[PDB]
Design a binder for this molecule. Sequence first.
Ligand code: OFR
Length: 125
Amino acid sequence: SMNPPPPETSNPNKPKRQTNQLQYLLRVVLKTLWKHQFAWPFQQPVDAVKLNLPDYYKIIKTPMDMGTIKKRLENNYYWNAQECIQDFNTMFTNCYIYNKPGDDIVLMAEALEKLFLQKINELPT
Ligand SMILES: C=CCOC(=O)C1=C(C)Nc2c(c(=O)[nH]c(=O)n2CC)[C@@H]1c1ccc(C)cc1
């Protein structure tokens, strides 16, 4: 039930950029979602072995988590805010794909996604 290597957080040949919005995604959006009581399942890549979820990476082919996103933001890995917002949406979507409506893990992702959309509704200029 092995785990794949985690998503890259650096890529020297990918062009970096630092923008007002990406600074905000780290300092405001990520760091406060991180403190939510429901953040803990999403703070690191899914451990299919530890969690006896041996099928997780048979179903999820584009894994993403907030730990990866935080490191990407800290590394200026992203070209723009939309790229990072895409990663957040991948990790929410993955949760909805793998699990079922009403599952408690889905209720946690739904709560975080709602807060996420609340905070990105208005970004700096
Ligand atoms: C089965 C034993 C418990 O294992 C866990 O704690 C889990 C972790 C770390 N992550 C995931 C789990 C899951 O069921 N579906 C997923 O997509 N993820 C990845 C985000 C399970 C889980 C988490 C939280 C609740 C409330 C229930 C189940």
